[PDB]
Design a protein around this ligand. Structure first.
Ligand SMILES: *[C@@H]1O[C@H](CO)[C@@H](O)[C@H](O)[C@H]1NC(C)=O
Length: 110
């Protein structure tokens, strides 16, 4: 699924949904029609990421993004070689974002 491109489906009940973009290694949004899609369709970026993220995300930059609904999440600091805490803005981030220190450790080593 994570490998599949997004699918809006034939319906017209447009909604914003998340799909994992393996090129950007980021979950992004798309307008889903309400019926007939594929598995690369998530309601939250959390789900999308915990489902589709890979270890290549450990090499990605720590992105706060442009939004201000700040939440403190974990991310891997490649320079220090450790999982650090940062405030994610709520939108347009990438895969190097974990929802627990443990998860960050599990993905990027310890
Ligand atoms: C997936 O991400 C890449 C890199 O950001 C981008 O070029 C491409 O347009 C994205 N795919 C879609 C369907 O937006």
């Amino acid at each position: 699924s994570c490998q599949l491109g997004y699918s809006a489906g034939p319906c017209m009940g447009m909604t914003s949904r998340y799909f994992y973009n393996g090129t950007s290694m980021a979950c992004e949004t798309f307008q889903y029609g309400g019926c007939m899609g594929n598995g690369n369709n998530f309601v939250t970026e959390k789900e999308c990421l915990q489902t589709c993220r890979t270890v290549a995300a450990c090499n990605l930059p720590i992105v706060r993004g442009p939004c201000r609904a700040f939440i403190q999440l974990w991310a891997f600091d490649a320079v220090k070689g450790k999982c650090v805490l940062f405030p994610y803005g709520g939108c347009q981030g990438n895969g190097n974002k974990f929802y627990s220190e443990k998860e960050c450790r599990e993905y990027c080593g310890v």
